[PDB]
Ligand binder design. Structure first.
Ligand SMILES: [K+]
Ligand SMILES: [Mg+2]
Ligand SMILES: [Mg+2]
Ligand SMILES: [Mg+2]
Ligand SMILES: [Mg+2]
Ligand SMILES: [Mg+2]
Ligand SMILES: [Mg+2]
Lengths: 176, 81, 114, 55
RNA sequence: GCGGUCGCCUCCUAAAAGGUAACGGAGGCGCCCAAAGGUUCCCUCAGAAUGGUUGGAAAUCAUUCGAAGAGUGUAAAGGCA
RNA sequence: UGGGCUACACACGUGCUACAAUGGGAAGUACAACGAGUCGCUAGACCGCGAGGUCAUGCAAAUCUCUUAAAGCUUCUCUCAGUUCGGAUUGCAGGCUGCAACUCGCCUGCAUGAAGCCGGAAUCGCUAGUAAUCGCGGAUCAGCACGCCGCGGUGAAUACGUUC
RNA sequence: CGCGGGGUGGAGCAGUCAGGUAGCUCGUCGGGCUCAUAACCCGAAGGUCGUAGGUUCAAAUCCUGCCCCCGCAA
């Protein structure tokens, strides 16, 4: 909850003094953080998909939702209704804890982390990160990391804009 | 030289390069010396080395210093069968 | 275990450390001598302090990942500048001035009788 | 939060002994951590030729 | 005479009720479902743009655009957000 | 002068290393012969993990050196494994030669550690100090041969017999 | 435009009915035997079965089309 207390005390004055909001309820606020892991190879054998479910659980303390196709694609031998990977939706104190864990542990633990892209926005105030390589904190349990697949890590906000989101994540800790 | 002594290089080549002190790239130099080394002074020139049949050019950069000139002017135009 | 490899247990210390990508018999004996233990014990009979000292000196030394990165960056350098010695790699040929006529199967790979 | 499906998610401490930084957060009490924001920095052949042969 | 057709369903022909023929034009059926029924409760699609790892033109994730451009077991018509 | 005879989809011959425990590795220790040597063989000492380098002595030689040969023997360890086998290939550092070692040299060290678990059709050598295996020297040679020539160490089995 | 019969390694053919995961013979290539060639011997290469899709756990095979060949007609 250190991150939430920061968001309340340090960020919001430091944010409003710049952005000139006539009310605190214009504040950019992190509404959720979504994790996704697409697999595809699960169509070959979904035991790796069970493994991805396992790792999302180990990472978050939160069982994931298995996603499924709304279509069939002969190019990948893909059938509608079959499990393409998994996702998670963190909200609240768990979400803040996860983000703080990222910034304070597992962004440095990438082999060559000198920063991240600044342009990775949607043009509407929501950020999209991607782990190319797993095994970024100790409780990833390296003894059983069969494969590195990666993650999409969406960070949704009430931010109107790229600028609001960027400054928010700056004060929160994201090393752009 | 693999003996911890003078890194080998030809006197005339050294002479002409050191005369080329302003480091203009238009001052392109030729040689039949495939056996000489490369130095930091060479880094940035377009030298033309005799490969047995032609003066093949090559532009030097930082990643050539410990190497010879003949390594960048091969002599065998193999193209498969 | 040590640097990302679950080494054997019935083996002795030196010969089990040989299974690290970067440590042979000589450097293994040097490391065990710098640490000051017996070279003829089996790793399933170690004190974890000895294991930790071993891990410390190994991390001081250049090993699996750094070693791969170093050798591969060397190869990529000499390939990208365009030297003969890198054209050999890019073409799949031997590199130390060998004869590529009646031999060189360890780079050619499988034979193709044509 | 439903029962019998989620992992045990307990408050644990993360410690960077490189700087002694101490942080609390929930995961699956004290744990070992090597590097972090408070200990990470971002938060040659000519030279080598010269070293080998002095110039 | 051969070919084709003979029973049933849908459209056009069919002339703004219905009906309406031709060896006129186009297609389907001779089943499936034990949930693809019933009821109660809840939800709304397709595609495009943007960004993101393997992951591409395109799988999956997120926001916006999005009035139906989807889906409706199975033909076409009608209809249904 | 530089390049090429050293290429490389491939095929063949002659060799070397192997695919292991009759063995690998560490230590100690024993027994040869032929032959070569002046700007050459080089003792001994020191440095260096090593290849080798500095000093310096003897020898134009049965007087000195190359030269304490290796297999072998006695111990220790490895205990069946693509292994501590195998050593290729490759990266890095060095050493020598020599104006110059990239094409295109030899050696060493470190690291990797491929193929290969005795080999199809077929085919080669050998009857005794032979085969088999073990090393040593020399000619060419500034430097470089798994080849060539010679040297000696250890040391078998078989030959019924001419059907083919 | 239609009706029959065909599209399986280089040639010829089965396997199609009855789905069970591509084969027979010859030929080509390489190495052996031979003074040499043929024969003979030991090896290999060459096709998801004309093609785009469906059905199926699985298709050369069953279904739907599309593209070529031989007969008739045309
Ligand atoms: K010699
Ligand atoms: Mg050679
Ligand atoms: Mg009517
Ligand atoms: Mg020749
Ligand atoms: Mg060995
Ligand atoms: Mg005889
Ligand atoms: Mg033949």
């Amino acid at each position: 909850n250190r991150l939430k207390e920061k968001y309340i005390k340090e960020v919001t004055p430091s944010l409003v003094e710049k952005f000139n909001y006539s009310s605190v309820m214009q504040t950019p606020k992190v509404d959720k953080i979504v994790i996704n892991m697409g697999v595809g190879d699960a169509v070959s054998n979904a035991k790796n998909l069970d493994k991805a479910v396992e790792e999302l659980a180990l990472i978050t303390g939160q069982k994931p939702l298995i996603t499924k196709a709304k279509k069939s694609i002969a190019g990948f031998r893909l059938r509608e209704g079959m499990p393409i990977g998994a996702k998670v939706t963190l909200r609240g104190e768990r979400m803040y804890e996860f983000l703080d864990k990222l910034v304070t542990v597992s962004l440095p633990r990438v082999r060559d982390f000198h920063g991240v892209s600044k342009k990775a926005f949607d043009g509407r105030g929501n950020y999209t990160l991607g782990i190319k390589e797993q095994l970024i904190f100790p409780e990833v349990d390296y003894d059983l990391v069969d494969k590195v697949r990666g993650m999409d890590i969406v960070i949704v906000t009430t931010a109107n804009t790229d600028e609001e989101s960027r400054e928010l994540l700056a004060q929160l800790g994201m090393p752009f | 030289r693999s003996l911890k002594k003078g890194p080998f290089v030809d006197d005339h080549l050294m002479k002409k390069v050191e005369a080329q002190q302003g480091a203009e790239k238009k001052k392109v130099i030729k040689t039949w010396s495939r056996r000489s080394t490369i130095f930091p002074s060479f880094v940035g020139f377009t030298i033309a080395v005799y490969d047995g049949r032609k003066h093949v050019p090559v532009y030097i950069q930082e990643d050539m210093v410990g190497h010879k000139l003949g390594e960048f002017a091969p002599t065998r135009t193999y193209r498969g069968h | 275990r040590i640097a990302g490899v679950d080494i054997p247990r019935d083996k002795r210390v030196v010969v089990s450390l040989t299974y690290i990508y970067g440590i042979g018999n000589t450097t293994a004996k040097k490391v065990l001598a710098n640490v000051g233990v017996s070279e003829d014990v089996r790793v399933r009979d170690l004190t974890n302090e000895q294991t930790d000292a071993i891990r410390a000196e190994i991390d001081k030394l250049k090993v699996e990942g750094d070693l791969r990165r170093e050798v591969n960056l060397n190869i990529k350098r000499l390939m990208e500048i365009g030297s003969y010695r890198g054209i050999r790699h890019r073409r799949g040929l031997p590199t130390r001035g060998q004869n590529t006529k009646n031999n060189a199967r360890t780079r050619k790979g499988p034979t193709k009788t044509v | 939060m439903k029962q019998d499906i989620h992992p045990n998610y307990q408050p644990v401490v993360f410690m960077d002994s490189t700087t002694g930084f101490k942080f609390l957060s929930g995961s699956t009490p004290l744990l070992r951590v090597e590097v972090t924001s408070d200990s990470h920095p971002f938060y040659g052949r000519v030279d080598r030729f010269n070293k080998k042969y002095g110039l």
